[PDB]
Design a protein around this ligand. Structure first.
Ligand SMILES: CCCCCCCCOCCOCCOCCOCCO
Ligand SMILES: CCCCCCCCOCCOCCOCCOCCO
Ligand SMILES: CCCCCCCCOCCOCCOCCOCCO
Ligand SMILES: CCCCCCCCOCCOCCOCCOCCO
Ligand SMILES: CCCCCCCCOCCOCCOCCOCCO
Ligand SMILES: CCCCCCCCOCCOCCOCCOCCO
Ligand SMILES: CCCCCCCCOCCOCCOCCOCCO
Ligand SMILES: *SCC1=CC(C)(C)N(O)C1(C)C
Ligand SMILES: [Mg+2]
Ligand SMILES: [Mg+2]
Ligand SMILES: [Mg+2]
Length: 549
């Protein structure tokens, strides 16, 4: 199988991770011709993305019916800094040109990573191993324009340098400029070090976002033992124009180890994080300094037809103190190629600055808490790889605005019951990748459905190659959703009808160096919204190329 590092921080085959797992490579992203992260993500199981319009507009990610703030987004294994002020991940500003791989694991994972990993985890990896220089560019609808240069070069054997530059610009709009460098060095065959730095300057209509991140690390990859020590600094500055500045610095230091033992592994690590915000950030008066340290244990073992996986973690947070989480999954391969999996896991979400210290702050709030149970069957039948999972997620201690006392409190519960079905198979030269999600996400106290969430989704990718034309068709059904209408007070909840959407993409190797690509997004120009009142794109055309040398 393809490897992931996201389940326990170290490489393992994805057949040994029991939680459902999706991997997107750069090759997929080039064929899809995605011009944003959201477009990559909306394609995958359990993902419901809403957006205040097109590219660059604020967005929310609802994994498996959970709140916007209950997905953990990592960049190269570190909590996305853009999410630090608001406490909820928004990838609409993150440059797609940095995205080399996505590992997405559904279900909880606080027991490895701490806060936010309730619905699942999305790790965006920016590292590639692909020697050479490449030039790319695109033109499309709304004066869309992209230029991109990158290279990877040995500087002597043992060392290599990566550089990337990207400019993307789209009127009505959204402008984004990105720069990335890395140095990778192999001290021995087992020992390695790296320093990575990147930044992007975005403008959106007037919002002005700038972010930089620097990472530095040491890894040991032995025959049995693996170790990693990584430090990370991020600094973002977010201007809105009267005058609002949100600024945050995030520091991380993590040390993990993992050893192969019996038929599997055992791991442990320690994780430290500091976030400082500047006065006035998040409509909070003072600057804050929040700290967290966690310690966790992981395990995986195969015995006969059974697989057991687990993680357990204790976090010590400077505001709410101590919270412990744990996860266990057992799988049973009862006949060759078929498997039942049962999982249980707790996870949490930390209070955010606004909830804590804003005008309606409550400095004594506790984390939001999740308990999740999941059961799955997977199999390989007649060339079809498939899986069907049912899950229940009880969330409690939700942080809610109390209008009577003008303060946030822990109160309030949600019950989510869902089914995920996926399959992939070929029929002659055709490859089919399909998924179906049912999500019944409610307020558990009133029994009413949560807003902003599609109860059902169907997703289908159909790929094939005919001459030297490589074709991809993308279909999605976004089901019924409820939302509030803010044009009239009191704001009333409205029912937004299901919608089907189609994209067509093609690529062609003009020569061995030159690939040209075309896309039509929203082929039937379907008029729809994912947030009530905010119009989405309509039919758009892209045309691009890349040249390798
Ligand atoms: C009363 C319920 C609480 C149970 C918590 C027990 C924690 C689970 O671990 C039990 C001990 O098993 C450790 C196995 O370690 C896994 C890998 O190494 C063994 C290689 O075969
Ligand atoms: C020696 C302990 C190393 C493994 C501890 C990680 C497991 C976290 O605890 C979860 C409790 O679940 C009960 C254990 O049964 C499942 C086994 O988990 C896989 C470890 O082999
Ligand atoms: C590596 C081991 C991980 C497995 C540990 C999970 C087992 C938890 O056991 C029960 C916990 O009991 C909670 C203690 O009570 C304090 C708070 O609730 C009190 C209610 O009045
Ligand atoms: C390498 C060690 C990793 C151990 C982390 C264990 C995390 C266990 O968290 C499970 C939650 O358990 C519920 C009770 O925890 C509250 C603390 O209670 C201890 C004092 O009463
Ligand atoms: C919900 C879990 C699914 C459980 C039912 C599926 C288990 C099916 O087992 C099928 C065994 O395979 C029989 C197929 O025929 C054999 C193929 O050719 C073998 C060479 O002679
Ligand atoms: C391994 C089981 C996979 C679940 C597949 C769907 C089966 C549905 O049939 C049972 C009836 O469903 C009752 C309500 O379903 C919504 C619950 O979603 C699952 C979480 O409990
Ligand atoms: C899918 C339920 C029947 C047993 C599993 C068969 C293999 C699943 O592959 C399905 C992939 O396609 C999704 C279609 O889903 C319709 C059934 O959804 C389950 C509703 O509870
Ligand atoms: S959170 C890990 C877990 C698994 C199971 C054995 C069902 N448990 O009782 C706990 C809650 C320890
Ligand atoms: Mg212009
Ligand atoms: Mg070794
Ligand atoms: Mg408390």
């Amino acid at each position: 199988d393809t490897l992931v590092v996201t389940a326990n921080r170290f490489e393992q085959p994805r057949s040994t991770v029991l939680a459902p797992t999706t991997v997107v490579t750069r090759q997929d992203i080039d064929r899809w011709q995605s011009t944003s992260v959201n477009d990559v993500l909306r394609r995958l199981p359990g993902v419901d993305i809403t957006q205040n319009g097109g590219s660059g507009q604020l967005s929310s990610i609802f994994i498996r019916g959970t709140n916007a703030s209950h997905v953990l987004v990592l960049i190269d294994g570190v909590r996305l800094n853009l999410a630090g002020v608001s406490g909820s991940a928004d990838l609409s500003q993150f440059p797609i040109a940095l995205v080399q791989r996505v590992e997405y694991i559904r279900g909880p994972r606080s027991a490895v990573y701490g806060s936010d990993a309730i619905g699942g985890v999305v790790n965006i990896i920016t590292t590639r191993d692909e020697p050479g220089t490449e030039i790319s560019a695109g033109w499309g609808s709304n004066s869309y324009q992209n230029y991109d240069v990158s290279t990877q070069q040995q500087l002597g054997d043992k060392t290599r340098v990566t550089l990337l530059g990207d400019y993307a610009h789209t009127h009505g709009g959204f402008l984004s400029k990105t720069l990335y460098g890395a140095l990778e060095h192999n001290f021995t065959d087992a020992w390695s070090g790296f320093v990575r730095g990147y930044g992007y300057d975005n403008r959106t209509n007037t919002r002005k976002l700038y972010s930089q991140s620097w990472d530095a690390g040491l890894r040991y990859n032995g025959e049995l033992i693996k170790s990693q020590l990584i430090t990370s600094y991020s600094h973002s500055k977010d201007y809105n124009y009267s005058a609002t500045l949100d600024e945050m610095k995030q520091y991380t230091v993590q040390w993990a180890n993992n050893v192969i033992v019996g038929h599997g592994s055992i791991g442990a690590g320690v994780d430290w994080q500091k976030q400082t915000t500047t006065p006035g950030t998040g409509y909070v008066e003072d600057g804050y300094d929040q700290r967290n340290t966690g310690i966790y244990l992981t395990g995986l073992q195969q015995v006969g037809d059974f697989t057991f996986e687990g993680a357990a973690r204790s976090d010590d947070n400077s505001q709410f103190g101590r919270h412990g989480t744990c996860q266990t999954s057992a799988g049973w391969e009862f006949i060759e190629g078929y498997r039942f999996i049962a999982s249980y896991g707790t996870s949490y979400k930390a209070p955010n600055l606004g909830q804590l210290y804003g005008f309606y702050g409550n400095p004594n709030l506790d984390p939001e808490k999740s308990k999740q149970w999941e059961g799955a069957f997977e199999g390989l039948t007649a060339g079809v790889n498939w899986r069907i999972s049912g899950y229940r997620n009880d969330v409690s201690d939700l942080i809610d605005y109390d209008d009577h006392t003008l303060k946030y409190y822990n109160e309030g519960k949600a019950r989510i019951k869902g089914v995920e079905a996926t399959a992939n198979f070929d029929t002659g030269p055709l490859t089919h990748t399909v998924s179906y999600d049912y999500v019944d996400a409610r307020n558990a106290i009133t029994d009413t459905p949560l807003l902003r969430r599609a109860k059902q989704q169907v997703k289908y990718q159909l790929d094939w190659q005919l001459y030297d034309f490589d074709w991809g068709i993308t279909y999605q059904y976004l089901g019924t959703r409820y939302d509030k209408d803010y044009s009239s007070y009191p704001y009333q909840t409205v029912k937004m009808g299901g919608v089907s959407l189609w994209d067509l993409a093609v690529a062609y190797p003009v020569t061995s160096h030159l690939t040209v690509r075309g896309k039509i997004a929203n082929l039937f120009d379907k008029d729809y919204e994912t947030v009530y009142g905010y119009q989405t794109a309509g039919r758009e055309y892209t045309l691009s190329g890349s040249y390798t040398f």
